[PDB]
Amino acid sequence: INWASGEDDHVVARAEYDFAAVSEEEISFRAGDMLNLALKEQQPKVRGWLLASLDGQTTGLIPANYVKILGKRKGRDEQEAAFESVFV
């Protein structure tokens, strides 16, 4: 999964809050953690969730409003905007 590793273009986000997964579909993270997100083109429609990776291999759902979207980064609506904007 090349967006997860950052081999492909991907979105980067910073967790605002701690989050413990309650199902296997979800991934845990801590406030301040950096995650890679699928591009909007690869995002599933699950109200209140986004597809992300903490570890660069494992993917799952995180609550959209538990992270700050920082922008699109090249592979080696305030939120809709941030998904198309460039990461510094």
Author numbering: 265 to 340, 371 to 382
Authors' own words:
Import of proteins into peroxisomes depends on PEX5, PEX13 and PEX14. By combining biochemical methods and structural biology, we show that the C-terminal SH3 domain of PEX13 mediates intramolecular interactions with a proximal FxxxF motif. Strikingly, intramolecular interaction of the PEX13 FxxxF motif regulates binding of PEX5 WxxxF/Y motifs to the PEX13 SH3 domain.
In this study, we present a high-resolution structure of the human PEX13 SH3 domain with an intramolecular FxxxF motif, demonstrating the structural basis of this non-canonical interaction with an SH3 domain. The domain boundaries defined by the NMR analysis were used to generate chimeric constructs which contain the PEX13 SH3 domain and the FxxxF motif (D371EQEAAFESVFV383) separated by GGGGS (GS) linkers. The structure of the complex shows interactions of the α-helical FxxxF motif and SH3 domain mediated by hydrophobic contacts of the two phenylalanines, which clamp around β1 and β5, and polar interactions involving sidechain and backbone contacts. Interestingly, nine out of the eleven Arg and Lys residues are located at the FxxxF binding surface, forming a positively charged surface area, which is favorable for binding negatively charged peptides such as the C-terminal FxxxF motif. Strong chemical shift perturbations map to the binding site seen in the crystal structure, and spectral changes at saturated binding are very similar to the native SH3-CTR protein.
